[PDB]
Structures are given as structure tokens and as C-alpha cells.
Amino acid sequence: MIQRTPKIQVYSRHPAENGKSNFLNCYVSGFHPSDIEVDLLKNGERIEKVEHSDLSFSKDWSFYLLYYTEFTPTEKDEYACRVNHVTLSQPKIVKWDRDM
Amino acid sequence: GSHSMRYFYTAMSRPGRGEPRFIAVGYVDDTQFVRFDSDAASPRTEPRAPWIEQEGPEYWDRNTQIFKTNTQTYRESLRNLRGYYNQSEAGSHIIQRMYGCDLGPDGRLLRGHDQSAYDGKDYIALNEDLSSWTAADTAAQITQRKWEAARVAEQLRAYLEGLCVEWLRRYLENGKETLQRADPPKTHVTHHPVSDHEATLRCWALGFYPAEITLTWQRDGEDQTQDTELVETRPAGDRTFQKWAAVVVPSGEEQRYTCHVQHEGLPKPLTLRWEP
Amino acid sequence: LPFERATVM
């Protein structure tokens, strides 16, 4: 039975500006089957109030989800997305890069 | 001015962890407008776009009765299909279904769709005639014989040509300020050295609706298709989408590269370059 | 509006 690993992108809803409130997004897509865990991290620690979109899928049947939280970027606060899926040996961490 | 309505159903078994979950979500183009989740504390159809809220209690009732009935029906289909593949009772499996109607710029039916998948592989699909079926394998041929016996294609043709189209047209009117409004991308080009010999040019599209867009790099006026890194179109969370396309160029041949942008919301297709 | 008929596979 065929399984598909999630693609992960970490980015902000609006262009990033230090000290301006924004949204940190983690978008997982291309995966199958649909169980997945996604956390947003602030300096390596799990952020508490995170919302996500309702489960849906693309024309290729692969699922996608958007996780998001309000945040205020600074010069030195590190943000990341940690994802586990049955298809990964251990959680994958992708760092938020402003130019990405 | 082209539009579509789709419903996406996902039924996922989970042995040892209760009865299969059934989720249904409804879209017009890239805008979600309803959901139903058999796992919700109180399972009911819920609005997900402001323009569907005006629908009366009769409408929400109707929706909820179909989705509860489907919750049950899909639990049996999961049982059935596990048997069709001689599968163990230990494994978790998924049925997905997507169906709806496509309208042309005039508002006429362009075509209908009704497809189903099992564990992420095509399983059975209503053909474009809306009269016959394409079954992916011998298990789906069993489903096909059952769907031929219940005249399912006839019933789906009637819905796709009738109710589906009338409702989509109702929704496009009630949501006209957003559903019939295309937001063009806001674009720029960034330049980052990756070496002393070369540099990355990344062309950005932000804030656009709907998701469909084309972003291409050209060198001396010809596509750099293999050399372009193209990231998947991603939602912003404010209804709009984002995308970029990057190329690594010899320094400084930067002026020989143009970014090309097409989107339904643009006055004209755009040509951009890095502006140092 | 969703299709009104549920049919078992």
C-alpha cells in the first residue's frame, strides 16, 4: 500500500516586519494517509494555541493542512515547524526563513 | 469568470480506535464554505464562509441528514472494500470522493465530475458522459455492477446538470463580492548571492485569489523550465495564496532574466526583473 | 448543495 511523505513550508501570512504582529503558517501537503502531527515551535518549544484548516485533499488525492498561530517576529526569536507522519522515521523540523 | 463547486468526502477506518471518521467539506473554486465531521462533539453541517450563513434552518437540516446518512453508508463501504482486497481487519484504510460541476464564463455547465479513491489510488470514476463508469481494477468492477443496479449514474447526471448548477449559481450571487472577484498577485524579485560566481533570483507572487497562477523565468527570452525551482502554491490564511520561482544565474547576467506572471486578476500579463 | 443519495460501494 502506497504512502506519501508531507511537503512542508514555513512562512508568514504578511511580509515579515520585526515587532509587527503577523501569522506564522505551516503548510503540509502532498501526504497520504491523513494522520499527521504538526507543531509550531518558538526557540525549540511547542506553541500552545495553534489552529488548523479542515482536512481536504488535492486532485491527486493527497491531503493538505494549514497550521497557524498569531506571532510577532523579532530579530532573534527562532521559529520552526515540526512534523511527524507514518512515512518519517522521526519528526522533521523545518525552520522559518523570512526569504522563503 | 469560470467557476466550480466541489464536495470532498474522506472516510478513514481506525481499528481499535472506534468507528470510521467521516469528513465532508464543500468548496466554490478555492473557497471553503461548509464542513461536517462525524468526530465533532455535536456533528452538524457548519458554515465556513459568511455568504452561506443566510441559508435557512431547512438548508442546514438537509445538509446534516445527507452527511449523517453518508457517515453510515461509508462505514459499510469501508467494510466492503476491505473484503474486495482480502485485507486484514488490523489495517487503517481510506475512501475519498470528489464530485461537482464546472461552469463556463457564461454560467453554463462545462462538465460534471464524480471520482472515488481507495487508499489514495483511483478506484472508480464517472465518465464525462455522466452515463458510464471507469473502474480501476476488479474490486471497483464490483462497485460498478452495484452502482449500475441502483442507476447511480442516472441520479448523478440529474444532480450535476440540475441542483449542483442552480446552487453554485445561487452561491456565486450571494457571495459575489468575493467569489466573483479576482485579486492579482503583488510581485517582486529578490537577489541573494549564493557564491562569488552566481546568485539566486526569486520572483514572488503574494496576495492572489484564486490559486491558479503561472510563474516562469526566462533567460534571453526562453523558458528556464528545468532550472527553475518552483515552490507549491500555498495559502496565506486570509483567503489568498502565495508562490515563488527561483533561478541561479551567473553573476552579473541578472539582466538577461525575466520573470513572467499570469493570473486571471491581472490587467495584463507581467514581466519583471531584479531592480538593483 | 451536496448530492442527496448515499450509495454503498
Q: Which domains does chain B have, with CATH numbers?
A: 1-181 (3.30.500.10), 182-272 (2.60.40.10)
Strands B198-208 and B241-250: antiparallel
Q: What was the resolution (in A) of this experimentally determined structure? A: 2.0
Q: What CATH homologous superfamily does A1-100 map to?
A: Immunoglobulins (2.60.40.10)
Q: Are C5 and B155 spatial neighbours (Cβ–Cβ below 8 Å)?
A: yes
**Way the structure was solved:** X-ray
**DSSP label at residue A5:** P
Listed residue (B193, B236, B97) closest to A13, CA to CA? B236
Which candidate in B21, B86, B96, B123 is best for mutational testing of the A interface (most A CBs within 10 A)? B96
Can you read off the three cell numbers belonging to residue B197?
560566481
Which residue, chain included where needed, has cell 495559502?
B235
Listed residue (B23, B252, B6) closest to A58, CA to CA? B6
Q: Any idea of the CA torsion for B244, B250, B253, B256, to the nearest 10 degrees?
A: -50
Task: List, as ranges, residues 201-260 from B with C-beta within 8 Å of C.
Answer: none
Using H for helix, E for strand and C for coil, what is the string for chain B? CCEEEEEEEEEECCCCCCCCEEEEEEEECCEEEEEEECCCCCCCCEECCHHHCCCCHHHHHHHHHHHHHHHHHHHHHHHHHHHHCCCCCCCCCEEEEEEEEEECCCCCEEEEEEEEEECCEEEEEECCCCCCEEECCHHHHHHHHHHHHCCHHHHHHHHHHCHHHHHHHHHHHHCHHHHCCCECCEEEEEEEECCCCEEEEEEEEEEEECCCCEEEEEECCEECCCCCEECCCEECCCCCEEEEEEEEEECCCHHHEEEEEECCCCCCCEEECCCC
Q: Which residues of C touch B59 (CB under 8 A)?
A: 1
